[model samples]
Target: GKSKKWKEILKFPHISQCEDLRRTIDRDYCSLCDKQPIGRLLFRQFCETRPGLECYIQFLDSVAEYEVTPDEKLGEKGKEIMTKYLTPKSPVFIAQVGQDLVSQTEEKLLQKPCKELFSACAQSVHEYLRGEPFHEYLDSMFFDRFLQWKWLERQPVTKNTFRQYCACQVRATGKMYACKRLEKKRIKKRKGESMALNEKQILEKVNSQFVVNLAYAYETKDALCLVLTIMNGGDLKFHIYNMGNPGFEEERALFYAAEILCGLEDLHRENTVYRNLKPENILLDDYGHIRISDLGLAVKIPEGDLIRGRVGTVGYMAPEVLNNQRYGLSPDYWGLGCLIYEMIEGQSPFRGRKEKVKREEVDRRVLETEEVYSHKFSEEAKSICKMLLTKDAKQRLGCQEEGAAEVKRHPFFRNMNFKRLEAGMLDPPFVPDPRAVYLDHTDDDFYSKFSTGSVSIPWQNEMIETECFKELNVFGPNGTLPPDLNRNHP
Candidate 1:
């Protein structure tokens, strides 16, 4: 009924043309492409004006129709599909099909007429698209390689720590991100592979504004790279200790305390225990909002289980943790108490003087000393800190039956609009100067990880099965899908 139109199929670029045109397509179509890498290949293969694309759409329509059709009328449904696409003289015939696959269809027409009827052809296409050319396309399309990002050589954001971080610009979107680079050699020697994997796993599960976002994760041969949200406002440590003021005023401290509490609550809700919570680990974004950043010591504790280890910074660690007792989320509130206390007092409560004290002294102080408050601490601040620093874990402010709700109701947070805070609507007390680098270059001290005895947390390995890194092409090298990708495929 219609004049022949140019197929334009041959005019379209082949998958091999990507040594040139591939880069242009990847940058433009990465977002619009299918979530599944295989699905993207199918779209590219049939992208131009081809009868294959038209026939596939028709087949999908027929299958959708068969789903709602009466069981008794399924026989008639098959006959319609046969006339429309399978018959040789059909206007929209899918050509070049094997005779055997097209043969013996009438016997099973009523018995098992469904999508899988033509599944043989589909399976063939799926397999055909998964060859070498497809992989080369994936290399160009995915953000799995370290080479994909442009690393800037400016002053490293955070100084000499166990790991190094730099501000990197992603080439695809021109977006800047803080890249946390962990050396495979160091991680292997320390036997901290589990720790590295755990951090990535936890970051994948967590999604909150109060917590840092894990934007991209990929590994090179020598390192595992975690691209996180760039926090240009520096850390709370610099603001509290290095700023001209000894400590933040109650008004300023309250704002950070509110955000920190919300962040901790979010972590707990995710069934994670942030064993390490300190001013140094808490970073500020460009907007001056606080985000809990270092997840190395964070663990996803199962419902009935409690995590045990003398892990965390010496000064901020909870007394129960100092005693080496099995604990849960309560320790995090204790850490919170220390942070709030430091925000007002300018130093950790248990640490003797800013000059420095031995680790033993700090641990003893954490267990034996009662917290003292100065005039800087208002009655509300003192009360919250007192309840939060309680030695009895069960009696801790946030450990009560009401949980964080009880902590939220306290007079210390009296001025807080929790709804606004959670929605990120509250205005920050201090807006960081965009022009200045907030890092205190003179402060050369690097905190060391402290762990005594068996220091392993129960890893619900299944929790790491996530969708974020599915297309990395690193996990599954063989023909089969990775543990994480298998869930999405079927």
Candidate 2:
């Protein structure tokens, strides 16, 4: 009945190229192309309109028929949380609260705007306008990443399937947070799932006065959302660089050093070793207090035993770590010495640009030689540095049998009271003022426009468009990216 549309006798059902191309007679249809890297090769071998000599059609099938409606795109059921947690300081706030907010920015959406992206490392001066947590340990913050998207949809309203979504920040104030996006799929793919999950679990259990608080974590599609407390006052690494002259004068370094020690006290008590104890991971909030940040490499070591993992940043790895032998929390104390040295001397005890031997030779010097520090400080400072930097981890102050208690009672901190320090009663020797920064992110000309109602769509490029990709919607919706060539694949 239909001209050349049907075949003659003997033509039954099938499963071949016809099935692959049955949806459309369009060009180079290939979904497998994205699957294995060999997809492109297989596509050329099987289907290519032949140009002049191609032929391959094991009839796939007569498609199962059903009445269906074509649907327009744009999607987030997570908008409830998305709006609930969006930063109040962001220009996105205007659209979130006003009556005509949505339509007001529609024109801006069509035309787009020029925008600039900045780094987390960019220093900011909080001139009365700077946007800037710790916890009782648990919170209303924890929620499932996401379960399934389709189960909730009714017979009429369709929904796509996804899991592991994120929770938006539901705080009631104008506080700022460093929202780190964890690509669950990719993270587990590249890094071991056990390790990734291990990191999450460690961070979850690890909230105290000293460590970065894992404020809350939930799911957003394929990411493990971690809402961590931000240290607006930059890191000790940068703090050292900015505070000129003879490094952070003895009093200042001692203040921060004591604070960091208190932080370590809590960490050890919680049963973990902060393997990466370099200055970069040590962040400061508005007050002069410092809290340990990055925990990707940290491992949980019980009070008596040790956990084995040959991982850590190179320059700061302790002698035990470099030797690849099993070691416990002592290495962290050794790290403390390195950081303390860097804080006071403006250079690491083992190395610096001027005093550095072979930059890569962490093995020989750390293990073989007893490197000396430039003795230009109070004997208290010099003595603590020596005691902690001793070649044997056993000899390290905090490494001893008494642990943090031994370090607390060291002659270096003879006058200090750990309890008072924890309570924030002692005055900090130096409260780093942001005005001391070389570049202030608070006054960005490009970014400020959004807050002033001067620009729309935050970004100029096509990388981010909808609220789903905003900081609040990190666990955004999922779908195949724009298909290529002529394939109509979803």
Candidate 3:
């Protein structure tokens, strides 16, 4: 009867959180865990990402599901959670748990076991986690170390100095990818460990043609590495400014703008906000196709909710964000406006005439200034820019009920075929000089050696199965391989 009820509980929409619990238990969990799968999942979730109060409330629900108190060791588990997430002293601690319950829990924590301790706090915690405030709070609290980089040998390809990233070749597949290296010391010092982890998860979650994709994630003792699709064509900033001319022709600008729109649309559809959208974050692939990259500031906003953060480059930030108001995906449209304007005008819409304008003045302009259209802007382009750059987010072109469709129908895009654009059938107005960076852009034949397809095997299973990495004991101390398993001596 309890098993039947548990299965049915998984079917409930509100209880969808239990599906991971149930699936793991029914599938591959029995061998690895001692207690129920709910507890196991909670432990793992807490261990990896330090998930927020909502996840903990779900954990409390799991405890109630079993009816029986968890094993005595769970008391230890509860204590660790309390110390890390519930205590005010802990950096990850959340205020939504309330001081009263916190105090009450602390008073009884030493005397009771896991289930008993959380039972008293569950309802209160659940109430808070369900509220809109907690929705915003989820922003702050968002890693697996596989034997990383051992299987992949680094080729002396082009290196990026702005970020510790480089193009590396996979030993097994002979494929090249961009590797982002985050040093553990630096991440911890800057208190950006969670941010790094957030970027990793976002990259893993979002898969789109117009967005750079994560191929593999792993970590060594000193740092973490995310292997991503290499954009050999470099970034839009390089093409726009670093190239001899700063301005792109209307045809080329439209091509880039359309791809960027599609990219932003995909991110919004996924309930993610590309909080930072600038030329530096937009990269061009080998075929001159654009891919939105650098998700460090991107945030996932729950449906019907808005997230608060003044994130994004100063000039490109939307007025709502600059004003510190809650916002959704509309800021990206404003960013797209700024981007398109810069493409044709060769300068940001809100740019000051004097070089090296103060950031404060820029924010003021973003909040209050209206942009003047240059002679180069066509009527259609000017109209779209005005609609997108509207200070009122509600009135913004892409913020309407139709979302991206509202902007796509604009006269600026009338000549562009979004259907063909998404299907990769549309030819780019420009392809990067292939000899630009991948292999120093030295030989035209060098670019042809790479497979254009971005497809990659699932990193979890394939990463460990590599013969060389396993043979070298590169899986490290926590690897799945058994220490005592017999090995054929080479």
Candidate 4:
């Protein structure tokens, strides 16, 4: 009888259109269009009203009958949507809605409150639209550059607002990660002052083992959040500065430099120039893997354009970049050369007393003069550095007609296998164990204040007693094992 009534609702066009039909229909009717039922019933009835409806309905009904229960099927559909649209693999970009929410404000939100809110929002949105076709809408809006540009033209922000901001900060933090709470207003101001589309596009198109991965991202009312894997050992700057003169071992430096070169090769292949490349922007992930971070000044090389602008850290800037001439990915190679020098010498090859130099003098020196390293550097290392540090961009190590190939074939990397490294066959030289006692806390004196035997030990002791350990299994077996009494006797 219920099926008959549903059929009547489907068959009687006039009755379906009737206002009184509202009383006869279920309460779950489309709130926006009460004339049509909502959810499955709405879809079903709407289909039946059309000529092709029966065929589609028959196919869907057959599927439903053969498939799992409605709720289970909905969950399965939702998981597929999540995997295809919401997961990191899908890499959706988010845009804030209003001018008030754009740029700096958005950046600030990313630091703390916004980060928390966005995480929650992501969870909530995922929960709310799990099995729905909303992901298709998101895909159409955020992933499509044409749609993004169109939306950006109309609104202060676009669908990728959250994604772009998150990408920038995540890349930045992967290098100079002081804290998560960067000022959003500052970032927005920078974006407003400059053309940021190039950077965004680069982030979207580039995916490499040497490049910091831009995973899934989302935005909240206040800020945008990008979820990225952290590089555990810190940035190259930290390593150089902390390790003192003649920094990391020669083998270590070469290993890292080779990794950097791999990254550069990928960038050059795509015609993308990392305008800013320096130790501060190069970081080591937990596995001691080197990655290029901070694409703040990166740009895609236009056809026939030799270089762009004076955009890079002053000391590490290539001669052409400092001279404000057209340069290609070669400048990045020059910067990498400086980075290699720093790795080997624990000091910038060009800038002595790096902190005191004026910006004008730094730029002038970078362009006008040739810098020399001490005799401590190996001849092969020196040769590579000399070639990269050449005052002319065209003559630089990886920029010439055969520069990259020549550099790769150099004696310095004679033992290295680039393909093997890319394939993960070769292990990193150093791996930081986060659980190791020595690695647990960098400063024991400061950490002692919070340790078990210190003045604050009372609070710490309380945690030891009341803290839930049921979830944390320490022993190999489920419970503690009995000690053997026969060991001494034996």
Ranking by TM-score: 3, 1, 2, 4
Tens digits of per-residue lDDT for model 1, 405-436: 89999999987767667766678987888996
Point out where model 1 deviates above 4 Å. 1-165, 352-356, 439-490
Name the runs in model 3 displaced over 4 angstroms.
Answer: 1-165, 352-356, 438-490
Better of 3 and 4 by TM-score: 3
Per-model tally of clashing residue pairs: 0, 11, 1, 23
lDDT of 3 at 82: 73
Residue 266 lDDT in candidate 2: 76
lDDT of 2 at 388: 81
Estimated TM-score for each candidate: 0.57, 0.54, 0.57, 0.51
- Residue-wise C-alpha lDDT for candidate 4, range 1-490, written one tens digit per residue: 0122322211212211233433443333222112211123323433343443234344333333222323324444433333333333343312111233323333433343321222332333333323232233223211122121122122222122221332232121122211122333455545422333344446545666787654332333343333333465677777777644537767888998998888887777778888778887888776778889877687778755665687666688777766677667778788877888888877776577546878787777777777777766788888888787887776777677764677898888877766567766678887757753211243233223211111111111211233211111122243222121111221
Summarize candidate 3's per-residue lDDT along 46-165 as a digit string, tens digits.
Answer: 334334543554455544532243355656666666776577777656566688878887766677664456666666655654454333422211101111121121112222211242
Worst 10 residues of 2 by lDDT: 58-67
User: RMSD in angstroms, all models?
Assistant: 17.8, 25.2, 20.3, 23.7
C-alpha RMSD (angstroms) for model 2 = 25.2
- Give each model's whole-structure lDDT: 0.63, 0.50, 0.64, 0.51
